[PDB]
């Protein structure tokens, strides 16, 4: 069952690294096996103190277990942060590494599980709540308050694993966080209203 | 090649635009459709993703060329010089009438 | 209700030194309204936690939003790559 599961991931990782060549980058052994929240602090300690991903599968470094893809999620997250700290925030290779990591992390999260409030005291008393929880990433935008115009900006395409301080081209610029809206969809009008007889 | 100046910015569409179905005389950019700077009057459903590059050999009549002619007939109802360029300009006035009939 | 408003403003002082990640003119475009973040453009109208059937307080944290995004399996992608060449 897991034999083809070792091959179908390898085929996607080979096909999705043509324009950027993430797999063909130089990568050392890097035996950390640590918390992936602390995956960059141990790398900075390795820099202060002192075999590529295409060759790991050729050498048989991954086994058909949970650790055999925990190490893959560790190694891809090691490669992507090295490429983020190598390329600047304006190059197209940065966006290619960001899109490749956002695809690879979703591909590694999938196919693994298959194998104080005054409203609350009324709503919990009157209804029954079935819950569903998930996590989303957010971004940052700029903010300029001129003479009664209230200027806004666009979505910064900076990756979530950049770990750089927030530089400002001007002191008077402000920063803000955009909360994403996600719920059940609104009932859109039909095709009689969309494309009506004018 | 027509210059499709996008809404709400001074940018130019490279190869893709978003044709509107209720204003019918504007387009959008790819980043402008991602970030939603099209105004609060619309609900982001009446925006058809169309192309801007050159098509294949003539008398093929793909879905974009079939949609834009029926859009322009509902706009003007005459003046086929103003109908042939709504497809993209690469179709003849004498040929769009033969296709519509 | 007006349609032909500007909704685009560019400051005359060019501070285009460290600005390459934003949306440039080719200057910085400054809108009158902010941006919106949409997670997934496709909605799975099944997955009965959303459709709420009338048969039978329960909490359940699902892994990732990709259940509601119609994500295919990797075996079909590998089969299509085998059909590519």
């Amino acid at each position: 069952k897991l034999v083809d599961f070792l091959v179908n991931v390898q085929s996607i990782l080979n096909a999705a690294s043509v324009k950027c060549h993430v797999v063909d980058e130089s990568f050392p052994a890097k035996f950390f096996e640590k918390n992936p929240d602390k995956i960059y602090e141990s790398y900075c300690k390795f820099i202060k103190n002192r075999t590529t991903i295409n060759k790991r599968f050729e050498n048989g470094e991954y086994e058909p277990i949970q650790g055999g893809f925990y190490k893959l999620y560790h190694d891809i997250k090691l490669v992507c942060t090295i490429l983020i700290h190598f390329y600047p925030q304006g190059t197209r290779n940065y966006q290619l590494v960001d899109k490749f990591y956002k695809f690879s992390s979703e591909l590694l999260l999938r196919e693994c599980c298959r194998i104080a409030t005054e409203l609350d005291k009324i709503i919990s008393y009157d209804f029954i709540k079935i819950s569903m929880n998930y996590t989303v990433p957010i971004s940052q935008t700029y903010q300029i308050r001129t003479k009664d115009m209230d200027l806004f900006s666009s979505i910064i395409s900076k990756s979530n694993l950049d770990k750089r301080p927030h530089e400002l081209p001007n002191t008077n610029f402000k920063i803000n966080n955009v909360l994403p809206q996600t719920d059940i969809e609104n009932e859109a009008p039909r095709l009689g209203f969309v494309g009506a007889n004018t | 090649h027509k210059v499709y100046i996008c809404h709400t910015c001074g940018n130019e569409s490279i190869n893709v635009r978003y044709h509107n179905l209720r204003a019918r005389d504007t387009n959008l950019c790819s980043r402008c459709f991602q970030e939603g700077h099209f105004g609060a009057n619309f609900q982001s459903s009446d925006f058809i993703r169309l192309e801007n590059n050159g098509n294949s050999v003539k008398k093929n009549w793909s879905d974009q060329e079939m949609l834009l002619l029926l859009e322009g007939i509902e706009m003007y109802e005459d003046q086929w010089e103003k109908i042939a360029d709504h497809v993209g300009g690469h179709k003849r006035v004498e040929d769009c009438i033969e296709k519509f009939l | 209700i007006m349609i032909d408003a500007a909704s685009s403003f560019v400051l005359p002082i060019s501070i285009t030194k460290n600005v390459d990640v934003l949306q440039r003119t080719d200057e910085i475009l400054w809108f009158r309204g902010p941006s919106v973040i949409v997670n997934e453009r496709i909605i799975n109208s099944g997955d009965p936690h959303l459709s709420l059937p009338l048969n039978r307080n329960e909490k359940e944290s699902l892994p990732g939003p990709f259940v509601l995004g119609l994500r295919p399996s990797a075996k079909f992608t590998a089969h299509r790559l085998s059909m590519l060449r």
């Binding site: 001129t146 | 027509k2 210059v3 499709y4 100046i5 996008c6 | 032909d4 560019v10 005359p12 002082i13």
Partner: peptide, 29 residues
């Protein structure tokens, strides 16, 4: 900084819909 109003960029819908991109056609000498 609050006295720094900007220049509006108009839509120009007639220049947005179907503008193209005459001595190149030899009919006017």
């Amino acid at each position: 900084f609050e006295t720094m109003v900007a220049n509006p960029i108009k839509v120009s819908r007639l220049q947005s819909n179907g503008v193209l991109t005459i001595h190149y056609s030899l009919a006017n000498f």
